[PDB]
Amino acid sequence: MREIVHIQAGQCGNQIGAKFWEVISDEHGIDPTGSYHGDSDLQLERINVYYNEATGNKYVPRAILVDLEPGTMDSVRSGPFGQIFRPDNFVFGQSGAGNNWAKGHYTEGAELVDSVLDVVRKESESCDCLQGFQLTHSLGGGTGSGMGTLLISKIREEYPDRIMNTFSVMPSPKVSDTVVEPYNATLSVHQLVENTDETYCIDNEALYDICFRTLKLTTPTYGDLNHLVSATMSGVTTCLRFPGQLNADLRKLAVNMVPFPRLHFFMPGFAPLTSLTVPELTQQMFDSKNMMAACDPRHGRYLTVAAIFRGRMSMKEVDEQMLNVQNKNSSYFVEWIPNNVKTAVCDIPPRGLKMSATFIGNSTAIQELFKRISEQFTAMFRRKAFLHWYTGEGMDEMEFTEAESNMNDLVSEYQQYQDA
C-alpha cells in the first residue's frame, strides 16, 4: 500500500488541487522545480505516496489535471508550483461543460474521458503497489461533477479492487454560480454513494461562514475558501504522508471509518481557526464552528471519528483530552461501536502554526446536507425548471426522479442509525 494517484477535475477541483499541491510540497520540502531542500528525514520517508522520482533527485506529483476548457489549467500552469506537474498530465478539452452535469457525464466529457484514462493508466503502471485514487472536484458545476463522476465509474471498472477517495465540494445558494447546482449535486451524490469508499464533504456555505464569522473576512473570495480547504486536505492526509500507525493507508482508514458501505460521507474540521494548548486545540476541533459540512454534530451521532494532531506536544495530554471529550459527551458517540474514536499525532506541524488538529467525523448529522440539496432540487424539479439544459444532452426526467429517490434513501439510512 504505497502509491496514490491524484486527479483534479473542473475549475473548483483544479483550483483547490493546485493549492493542495503547493501546501504539501512545502511540507515535504519540495520546491516549485521539484527539488528537495528539507532538513528532516520524516519529509522523504513516505514522499513516494504522492510523488514520483525523476532524474536528478526530482520529485513529481502523481497528479492528473482534467478540464473541459483550458482556462483554469492555464492559470494553474502559470501559478506558483505550476511547473512542478508533469506536462503530459494536463488533459483538457476546449468546449467547456456549461455548469451542466449531462455535458460532463454524457456528451463533452464522454469525448475526453479515454484520454484521461490513458494518463491514469500510465501513472498506475509505474506504481509498485497502488493503494487507490483521490479526486478533487465540486458537485455543483459540469466538469468536476459530471465528468468527475464519469471518471470514477470508469476507474472502478478498470481498478475494481482499489480504493476511491474524493474531496467533494458541495454547493450552497449563499456561495453559488448558477441555479442548476442542486441538480448537478443530486446527480453526482448518487454516483458517489455507489462508487467511492470515502468522500470528504466540503460545504461552500461552511467555508464562507468560517471566513466571515470566524476569520473576520468581510468579503471572502474563492481564494479565501480554498485556503481553508488546502489546510484541511493537508491535515486529513497527514497519516498517509508521514510515518505512523493509525489510518496509514486508504484501506485501513476505510475499515476504521465506514461501518456500512453507503455511509462513507465525512465531515472534516480544522483547528485552530482564529481572527495554543492541547485542551484548546481539542475543544476547537470538536467545535461545530470548526467543521466544514454546515451540519450540527449535536443533531446526530458519530459512528466513527479520526483525530489527527500535528506539532510538538504532549501525547499524554492529547490522550487525556480526547478521552475527556468522549467521556463528557458520550451520548453523541453511538454505543454499539466501542472505541470508535482513533487519534494520531504527527510531529511536523503545518506552515505558520506550532500545533494544529484535524477532525474527520462520520456523523449521522451529515443527513442535513443531503436534505438541503434535496429540498433545493425539488423546488425546481416540481416545475421541471431548467431541465431543457439536460434533456438537450439526451437525458430524460426519469433519471432525475431516480437520483432524487437515491439521495432520499441515503438520508433515510443515516436517520436509521441515529435512532439505533
Partner: protein, 69 residues
C-alpha cells in the same frame, strides 16, 4: 451503465438530427406553397387583363359590323 451512457448520447444526436430535418422540411414546404400561391395570384391578374384584350377586340369588331350598314 456503459450501455445507458451510449443510449443517452445517441438520443442527443437523434433529436438534433430530427430538429434539423424537421426545420429543413418545413422550410421547403413553406417556400413551395408560397411560390405556388404568388404565381397563381399573378396568373389570375394576367388572365383578367387578357380578358380585357379579348373584350377590346370584340368592341372593334362590333364597330366594324355596324359600319357595314
Amino acid at each position: 451503465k456503459r450501455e445507458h451512457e451510449r443510449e443517452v448520447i445517441q438520443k442527443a444526436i437523434e433529436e438534433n438530427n430530427n430538429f434539423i430535418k424537421m426545420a429543413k422540411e418545413k422550410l421547403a414546404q413553406k417556400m413551395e406553397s408560397n411560390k405556388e400561391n404568388r404565381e397563381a395570384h399573378l396568373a389570375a391578374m394576367l388572365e383578367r387583363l387578357q380578358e380585357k384584350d379579348k373584350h377590346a377586340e370584340e368592341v372593334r369588331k362590333n364597330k366594324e359590323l355596324k359600319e357595314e350598314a
